[PDB]
Amino acid sequence: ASVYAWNRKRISNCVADYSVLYNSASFSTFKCYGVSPTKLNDLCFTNVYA
Amino acid sequence: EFRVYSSANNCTFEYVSNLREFVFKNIDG
Numbered sequence: 001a002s003v004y005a006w007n008r009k010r011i012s013n014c015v016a017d018y019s020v021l022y023n024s025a026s027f028s029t030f031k032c033y034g035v036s037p038t039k040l041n042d043l044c045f046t047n048v049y050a
Numbered sequence: 051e052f053r054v055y056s057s058a059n060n061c062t063f064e065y066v067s068n069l070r071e072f073v074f075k076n077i078d079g
């Protein structure tokens with residue numbers, strides 16, 4: 001989607017795998033504010049928004 | 051005939067799968 005019409009998708013009721021995204025070795029930027037990205041797997045929230 | 055539901059807002063969890071007895075509790079979500 002365009003920047004003025006940024007799309008949203010909620011995700012819940014599933015098992016995430018952040019390490020695979022971490023070790024994709026293809027992204028250019030990766031900044032996580034307030035959380036340890038390597039310790040993301042050892043955390044549990046209610047829902048995420050992409 | 052299904053004439054009850056006439057909307058689609060924000061959704062959340064969705065699950066699909068003599069006499070009869072049932073009990074329904076609701077605690078801590």
Ligand SMILES: *[C@@H]1O[C@H](CO)[C@@H](O)[C@H](O)[C@H]1NC(C)=O
Nearest residue numbers: 010046047058059060061062
């Ligand atoms: C759907 O529920 C969430 C939960 O708080 C709320 O933030 C959101 O505004 C709701 N959507 C609409 C269209 O009301």
